[PDB]
Amino acid sequence: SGRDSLIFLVDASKAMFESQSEDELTPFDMSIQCIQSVYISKIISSDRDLLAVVFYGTEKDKNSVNFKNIYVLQELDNPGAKRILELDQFKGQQGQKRFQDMMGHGSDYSLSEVLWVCANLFSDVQFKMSHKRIMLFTNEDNPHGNDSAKASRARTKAGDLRDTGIFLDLMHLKKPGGFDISLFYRDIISILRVHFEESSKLEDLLRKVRAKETRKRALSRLKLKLNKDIVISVGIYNLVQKALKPPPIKLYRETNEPVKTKTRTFNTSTGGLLLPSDTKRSQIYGSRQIILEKEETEELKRFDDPGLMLMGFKPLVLLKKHHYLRPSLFVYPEESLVIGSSTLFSALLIKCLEKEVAALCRYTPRRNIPPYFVALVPQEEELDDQKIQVTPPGFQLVFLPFADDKRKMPFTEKIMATPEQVGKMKAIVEKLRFTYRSDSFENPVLQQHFRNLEALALDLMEPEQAVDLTLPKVEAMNKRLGSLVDEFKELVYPPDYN
Amino acid sequence: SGNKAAVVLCMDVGFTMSNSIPGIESPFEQAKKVITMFVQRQVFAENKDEIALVLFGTDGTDNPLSGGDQYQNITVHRHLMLPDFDLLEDIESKIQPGSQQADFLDALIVSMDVIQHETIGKKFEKRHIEIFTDLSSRFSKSQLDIIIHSLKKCDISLQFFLPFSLGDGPFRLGGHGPSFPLKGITEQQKEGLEIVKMVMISLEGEDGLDEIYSFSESLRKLCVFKKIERHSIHWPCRLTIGSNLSIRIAAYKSILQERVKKTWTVVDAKTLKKEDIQKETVYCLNDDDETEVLKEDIIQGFRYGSDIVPFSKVDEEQMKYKSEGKCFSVLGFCKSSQVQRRFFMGNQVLKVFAARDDEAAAVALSSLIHALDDLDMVAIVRYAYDKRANPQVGVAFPHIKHNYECLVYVQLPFMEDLRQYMFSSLKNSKKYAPTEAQLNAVDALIDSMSLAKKDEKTDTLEDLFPTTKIPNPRFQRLFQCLLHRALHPREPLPPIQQHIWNMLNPPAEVTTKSQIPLSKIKTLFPLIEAK
Amino acid sequence: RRRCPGESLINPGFKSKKPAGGVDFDET
DNA sequence: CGGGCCCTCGATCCG
DNA sequence: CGGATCGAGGGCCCGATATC
């Protein structure tokens, strides 16, 4: 685990304030806006991440060891609304003017000292830095080409940073006559060729990431008991989980500080706090009142013990697509508890995939919990052309419903459509054809929720309106099939409709 | 507003019911266990359905029709009325096996007279009789034609429960498979069975034979309520494809996790009253100092990373996303392969049926169902039960069966809901790759522990462990304990009844088959705990 | 153990993905 | 007067 | 070692509803 550290290093030389492509923002403006976009995305994806903003080549120097021409605007710290507000003072042409006024520009710098200050910035962090990363925004392909000493010292310090564990990524911006990596940045960066335009990576950085993504959390570590004597240890992971609106925090009208809630249970007759031993649970059916202790109410609840109990192997064809009860889980071995689990798990996955059969188990997640029948469907590993794990290898824990969970159906008379009507519905489907992606849609409630909090935080009167992706493109659909729509409607519905 | 029904349980209590086959609980105890299971559900679920109990072959006659020498050894223990704890207490211990034997058809006639007289004035929506016998007793074929005629004219459905199933070694009640002695059936039982078959076919056609169960299988199913189960509540909408094209639909929850109906009210251990206990919410500062914070001065706030921004509920309702409220709107169509079962979300499955008493909408929907079926495609739709509900995006796939035709909606995930983690590869884990002997050992394990058998020669695989048919043990276990405390307050809670363990464990043949391969994989697969 | 962020970009160990989709139509 | 939804707390485990 | 999550509580709408 860890809190991630990210340092944004921005060049402030004369070349950075001149825009190349006409009617286009200056490389500096591009950087400032990109940084702001990352900050906002981070206040959504991971708030504990620590960010920092350092400028170089400025006349005014503000830094730990008072290195000339290094202005550390923001130290390594969590993202905040005021930090984004401070960067907004440099956004645009007027913000550029504000920058030149607060601090100078185009001053002689020394990349060696710049990377030392950045490294010294990681030095001052106490919490676990899981990732150390520096993103250098510059449009100078060969800065110390004239100064040989500064260039070699910078190459040496870049090596020292990689040997420390710091990642160095270049965000090359538009340069007259192209940007050359071979001249400089080729050896310093942690691993193309001429790249005259701003690094494509900018489109991704600039694009806002309104996602509440969370560090991998094994939901539970259970025992998969093949038999009384054969027990392997597995980790249950929830690969899909409905992301919900964060709960509000109860504050105070003046101080605006959080208020802790303590929900206390006490007597009416006496007024004092009642002990849990003095309380009992009751259920009244008509006239009879059944009294059970809290322990008894849980004892009837015990049933099976916590863990996975292998029932057998059911062929996948028997598992029906319409028998979904609650969202599926992912089973992966846990070598950390029982050594040799992964080997048996691998053998089981391979032979289950070969035989096209799922492992039926009796799932009991915690103590004093009734069991449920689950089917571990063998999931094979899938890697794309980029060698990225698109589907991890293991078992999908598919929850199967009990007789109680299958609801009775209202018997309707079977009325089958004529082949002309179905072939015609085939034409509508063929025309409304589209490509489905699992990540095709974003939750509009959440998207609006976080757009509202961002706009209120930036004191922007206008709230940022997320376009609802879940609504169908009605007009486009009418354009694609207008006549066909009137034709079927004519074929099935008579004019004397209800 | 509720589905009512007159149920009469006709139990054979004859001496032969007390006659027990070694290892197996006597049909009397088996039938008692099944009846108690039924009454328990109707009692604790408080269904407004009336239940009567007739016992045949008991010593003597409670003269329900015994006008003479007729219908002897038949006692109407309970007349049609709402079941209570006194009835459960009587079944549990008061009712004892009798020494005489009666004609099961005569008892059926007594039950029919109960229904005929106690249902006056369309009080009940459904009428049902459940016969519990062993067929070992001799019987007369004299009024069978009249019995069938009176059953049809009164619209009463039947259900038979025998100690054996329609089709040796040890036997465990509620278990899957060997749940009745293969040998041990008498010619008298065979003759009675042939009459039972004919009667069930005469009432419900060829599929009537599916309504003849064995006590064991009856315990691991909800078939006993099948006829009195209340139909699921459906709600209407419109499937809106685009503009101008629409379809009047009515969807209901096909799958929905059945949870505890009754809630545990907290009462005092001495007085046993809700009034004496009260929960008050107190506000204290989050800060180290917990001075009381005024309930009125509390303002609503939300966190924006480090900053805490005060956002009152009033401004929230105004600034929040206003849903268009349109339900089941179709977004588009994609191939079946694009929608993977692993991405299914929610806690329900909806079956989108055609609006009742609407032919044009029934055909309009049938056309889409068959078009998606023939093209092997599905429909990505937008769904919301109301404008207040958060909008959902899900899959709508065709579902055509011999009797019914419908679309099946299952909610799919949003980008925020999806979680991407990286797991270590195992295909090429040099450290965990298994040997050929290990793989052929797992091969023997899967072959030995297979839960499916293919009936006939090439027919469809017959499942030996249908879990979707087994009832959630939570309910019958709760009813067992609740009744035990109501009747035996002095005694502590009883243990889990063995038949519940028998119905939850796989068929004995699978457990026995797995013995050998499990022992080979134990030695082949080394296991050690990490400490 | 194995801990490659790969194409995770800003969030290491978390695959980065395109936000759009739903209106890309093939012309049958 | 019930039915579906959704949120808020409370208890259980992992990081 | 606090979050994240999930059972089982609570509170707002909406078709049947005895009601003028």
Can you spell out the DSSP letters for B69-130? SSSTTEEEEEEEE---HHHHHIIIII----S----HHHHHHHHHHHHHHHTTTT--SEEEEE
Whole-angstrom distance, CA of residue B17 vs CA of residue B132 = 10
Query: Would an 8 Å CB–CB cutoff place B285 in contact with chain A?
Result: yes
Helix axes B104-118, B144-154, angle to 10 degrees: 30
Q: For A240 and E10, how far is CA from C1' in angstroms?
A: 27
Q: What is the DSSP letter of B468?
A: G
Inter-chain touch C14–B420, beta carbons under 8 Å? yes
DSSP state of A416: P
CA of B73 to C1' of D4 (A): 52
Pick the closest to residue B385 from B341, B357, B333, B348 (CA basis): B348
Contact A155, A188 (CB under 8 A): yes
- Contact (CB, 8 A) for B474 and A303: yes
Distance CA B139, CA B129 (A): 19
Q: How far is the alpha carbon of B123 from chain A, nearest alpha carbon, in Å?
A: 21
Report how far apart the first and last C-alpha atoms of chain B are (Å, whole number): 61
Q: What domain range includes position B29?
A: 5-228
A219: the nucleotide nearest its CA (via C1') is D14
List strand residue ranges (DSSP E) for A354-444, in order: 357-363, 372-379, 382-383, 389-391, 394-399
> Nearest protein residue to D10's C1' (by CA)?
A263
Protein residues bordering strand D (Cβ below 7 A): A 1, 215-222, 244-245, 247-248, 261, 263, 306, 366-367; B 1, 233, 235, 253, 348, 385-386, 388-390
Q: Which helix (H) or strand (E) holds A290?
A: strand A288-292
B80, B51 Cβ separation under 8 angstroms: yes
Residue ranges with strand state E in A173-278: 220-225, 231-237, 249-252, 259-267
Closest nt by CA–C1' to B300: D8
Which residues on adjacent β-strands are paired with residue A261? B283
Q: Is the CB of B415 under 7 A from strand E?
A: no
Would you state the torsion angle of the CA atoms of residues B235, B323, B310, B294, taken in this order, to the nearest 10 degrees?
-20
Instruction: List chain C residues with CB under 8 Å of B331.
Output: 22
CATH topology of domain A242-304: Ku70, bridge and pillars (4.10.970)
CA B83 to chain centre: 21
Q: How far apart are CA A412 and CA B363, in angstroms?
A: 13
Strands (E), A127-219: 129-138, 166-172
Selection from B208, B257, B261, B228 nearest residue B38 by Cα? B228
Q: Using CA atoms, how far apart are residues A100 and A106, in angstroms rounded to an integer?
A: 10
Which amino acid is residue B385, in one-letter code? Y
Asked if A164 contacts A119 with a C-beta cutoff of 8 angstroms, the reply is yes
HEC profile of B330-380? EEEEEEHHHCCHHHCEEEEEEEEEECCCCHHHHHHHHHHHHHHHHHCEEEE
Q: Answer yes or no: do C22 and B332 touch at CB < 8 A.
A: yes
Report the SS3 class of residue B222.
Answer: coil
**Cα B526–Cα B531–Cα C4 angle in degrees, nearest 5:** 80
A214-241+305-402 with A242-304: one CATH topology?
no
- Consecutive H or E run containing A76: strand A70-77
Within 8 A of C15 by CB-CB distance, chain B residues are 420
Cross-strand bridge partners of residue B334: B378
Q: Name every chain B residue with its beta carbon within 8 A of the beta carbon of C14.
A: 420-421
Name the strand (E) or helix (H) holding A449. Answer: helix A444-457
**Chain-chain contact of B332 with A432 (C-beta, under 8 angstroms):** yes
B357 CB contacts (<8 Å, ≥6 apart)?
none
Q: Are B292 and B283 in contact (CB under 8 A)?
A: yes
* C-alpha distance from residue A189 to each of A133, B36, B369 (Å): 11, 77, 57
In a mutational test of the B interface, the residue from A51, A241, A277, A311 whose CB has the highest number of chain B CBs within 10 Å is A311
Spanning CA of B1 to C1' of E17, the rounded length in angstroms is: 12
Q: How many of the other CB atoms lie within 10 Å of CB of B439? A: 18
Transcribe A8-33 into DSSP letters: EEEE-SGGGGS-SSTTS--HHHHHHH
- Of B216, B210, B162, whose CA–CA distance to B184 is shortest? B162
Find out whether B74 and B112 touch, Cβ atoms under 8 Å: no
Residues of C in contact with B424 (CB under 8 A): 1-2
Instruction: Give Cα separations from A360 to A134, B221, B337, B438 (angstroms).
Output: 49, 19, 24, 21
Q: Using an 8 Å Cβ cutoff, are A360 and B451 in contact?
A: yes
Residue whose CA lies closest to nucleotide D5 C1': B389
CA dist., res. A119 & res. A127, Å (int) = 15
Token pair 């109707």 in the structure block, residue? B42
Distance CA A407, CA A412 (A): 15
Q: CA-to-CA distance for B382 and A468, rounded, in angstroms? A: 11
Centre a 10 Å sphere on the Cβ of residue A368 and count the other Cβ atoms it contains.
15
Query: Chain C: residue nearest A469 by CA?
Result: C22
Options 3.40.50.920, 1.10.1600.10, 3.10.20.30, 1.10.10.10; CATH for A403-496 is 1.10.1600.10
> The tokens of B496 are what?
């889990």
Phi, psi of B454 (to 5 degrees): -100, 115
A365: CB partners within 8 A, 6+ apart: A220, A222, A236, A306
Structure token digits, residue A182: 């071979």
Pairing of β A166-172 and β A129-138: parallel
Cα–Cα distance measured from residue A117 to residue A61, given in angstroms and rounded to the nearest whole number: 12
| Partners of A406 in the β-ladder | B255
C6, closest residue in chain A (CA to CA): A388
Structure tokens at A230: 């054969």
Q: Is the CB of A217 under 7 A from strand E?
A: yes
CA angle in degrees (0–180, nearest 5) for A379-A381-A384: 135
Using an 8 Å Cβ cutoff, are A169 and A190 in contact? yes
Nucleotides of D under 7 A from a protein CB: 1-10, 12-15
- The full set of domain ranges for chain A reads 2-213, 214-241+305-402, 242-304, 403-496
Question: Which candidate in A343, A411, A434 is best for mutational testing of the B interface (most B CBs within 10 A)?
Answer: A343
**Is residue B483 helix, strand or coil?**
helix
Residue type, B339: V
Q: Coil, strand or helix: which one is A399?
A: strand
| Residue B211 main-chain phi, psi, to 5 deg | -90, 15
Least Cα separation, residue C3 to chain A (angstroms): 11
Q: Would you call C13 and B421 a contact, using CB atoms and an 8 Å cutoff? A: yes
Q: Is residue B451 within 8 Å of residue B510, measured between CB atoms?
A: yes
Q: CATH class for domain A2-213?
A: alpha beta
Gap between the Cα atoms of B302 and B293, Å rounded: 18
**Rounded distance in angstroms from the CA atom of residue A203 to the C1' atom of nucleotide D1:** 56
Interface chains of chain C (3 or more CB pairs under 8 Å): A, B
Please give, rounded to a whole number of angstroms, the shortest distance from the CA of B51 to a CA of chain A. Answer: 17
Which segments of A294-450 are extended strands (E)? 308-315, 329-333, 338-339, 357-363, 372-379, 382-383, 389-391, 394-399
Q: What is the DSSP letter of B418?
A: B
* Nucleotide closest in space to B389 (CA vs C1'): D5
**What Å distances lie between residue A263 and A268, B178, B279, B284, B313, CA to CA?**
15, 54, 7, 10, 22
* Distance between start and end Cα atoms, chain C: 48
Tell if the CB–CB gap between C13 and B422 is shorter than 8 Å. yes
| Residue A462: strand, helix, or coil | coil
Query: How far is the C-alpha of B528 from the C-alpha of B513, rounded, in Å?
Result: 26
Of A4, A46, A430, Cβ closest to residue C28: A430
Phi, psi (degrees; rounded to nearest 5) at B519 = -65, -35
Q: Which residue is nearest to nucleotide E17 (CA to C1')?
A: B1
Distance A461 CA to D13 C1' (A): 44
Q: Which of C5, C23, C26 sits opposite A473 (nearest CB)?
A: C23
Enumerate residues preceding breaks in chain B (C to N > 2.5 Å). 167
Give the separation between CA B84 and CA A286, rounded to whole angstroms. 9
Taking the C-alpha atoms of residue B244 and residue A489, their distance in angstroms, rounded to an integer, is 8
The two tokens of residue A323 are 């028998």
CATH 2.40.290.10 fits A214-241+305-402, yes or no: yes
CA dist., res. A137 & res. A17, Å (int): 13
Q: Find the residue closest to D2 using CA and C1' atoms.
A: B1
Q: Residues with Cβ < 8 Å from B439, sequence gap 6 or more?
A: A347, A350, A351
Question: What secondary structure letter does DSSP report for A200?
Answer: T
